[PDB]
């Protein structure tokens, strides 16, 4: 198989700056001038769109800010200047040999100024406690960049088992991220401890943001 390796896996580019995506093939995908390298753009909830065909030819309705280049085993996709609706997944693809293959994909996002999270904590609802369960929820909303660290503490001791995290996609309006952290316990273990704490460490500060509540 002709294996396509894209670089990087994800990329954050400021509006007006250059986005460059690389694709390397384990074998040549060109035959006598003709290039069998294609690029596809895909946005969430939408099918892939043919963006570049034959290495350097513009797809239908593709603006001049997109350009493809390369030959043989090394190809590149350039977007400049970056605009807000260019955020998408980008894939290289070859049709020279069966099986047809795709690159692993590159997630292009918008780079904006760093922003600290807005953190909220919520105790288990009375309805869930009646069912026998106990979930504690922590929202970390509207921060940038995406990676963030959440530490749960029960009576001051860190709790890692039973924690599930989920990041939203980048917001199409302010380019921030949000994340939920959910700690699920049994009702018995929940009622055996007093203080519950979600601690958020984000590169905006070395001091963590701490939200807490007593089960009281």
């Amino acid at each position: 198989d002709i294996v396509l390796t894209q670089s990087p896996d994800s990329l954050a580019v400021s509006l007006g700056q250059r986005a460059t995506i690389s694709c390397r093939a384990s074998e040549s995908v060109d035959n006598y001038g003709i290039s069998f390298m294609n690029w596809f753009q895909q946005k969430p909830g939408q099918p892939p769109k043919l963006l570049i065909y034959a290495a350097s030819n513009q797809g239908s309705g593709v603006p001049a800010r997109f350009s493809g280049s390369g030959s043989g085993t090394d190809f590149s996709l350039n977007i400049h200047p970056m605009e807000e609706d260019d955020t998408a997944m980008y894939f290289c693809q070859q049709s020279k040999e069966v099986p047809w293959t795709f690159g692993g994909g590159t997630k292009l996002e918008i780079k904006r100024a760093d922003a600290a999270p807005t953190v909220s904590i919520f105790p288990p609802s009375s309805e869930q406690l009646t069912s026998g369960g106990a979930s504690v929820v922590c929202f970390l909303n509207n921060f940038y960049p995406k990676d963030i660290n959440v530490k749960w503490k029960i009576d001051g001791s860190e709790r890692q088992n039973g924690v599930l995290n989920s990041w939203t996609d980048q917001d199409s309006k302010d380019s921030t991220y949000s994340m939920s952290s959910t700690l699920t316990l049994t009702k018995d273990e929940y009622e055996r401890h007093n203080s519950y704490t979600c601690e958020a460490t984000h590169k905006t500060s070395t001091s963590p943001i701490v939200k807490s509540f007593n089960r009281n």
């Binding site: 895909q42 034959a54 797809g59 693809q93 293959t101 692993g104 994909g105 996609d169 959910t182």
Partner: protein
Amino acid sequence: DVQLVESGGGLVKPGGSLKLSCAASGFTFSSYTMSWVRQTPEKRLEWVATISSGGDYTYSPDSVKGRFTISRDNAKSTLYLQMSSLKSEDTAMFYCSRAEFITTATWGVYAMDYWGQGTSVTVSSAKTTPPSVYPLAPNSMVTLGCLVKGYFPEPVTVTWNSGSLSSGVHTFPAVLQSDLYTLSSSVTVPSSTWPSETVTCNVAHPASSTKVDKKIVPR
């Protein structure tokens, strides 16, 4: 315009069978090579199968050979993918696409230029289960939320005040644990509007015929 409309996806048990269809319109279907391409839950694209215009020649990778069969009914302008011996890893969004000859500088190439909206295929042994909906109650703004726990399969839909609250809403992607999904949704409203006025989380889970309205009350 060229149009491709997929159908036939759904929830299937492992080892089961499922046939996808793709209805073409707006072009001479019998003149074109057609293909199926899938997108995994990890959002990666993978080629599935390709068939010549007359149906005489089919192509597929080793991962689907012997299990998936591509075919076409040119009289009905329809492309098919018959799947059998389905596995959990086959779960993906399946797209039909047309291969068209597009001119280049010196000659031309065949590229997949038109795609359908896709049809979702989920292979799982998990039982269909309605969600439990729990309220999440706590300056100028206040953040409320909704915990949607223990449902299968995807998707659920969450709105706030029947859609009257659209901005300041974060609905987080569901996470699978023990063959059950869980998600949360947060909403930020002016403190002057809650709890003086009602805020309600509306959850719909069509697979279990579920519509739930959970009012957020203090404490």
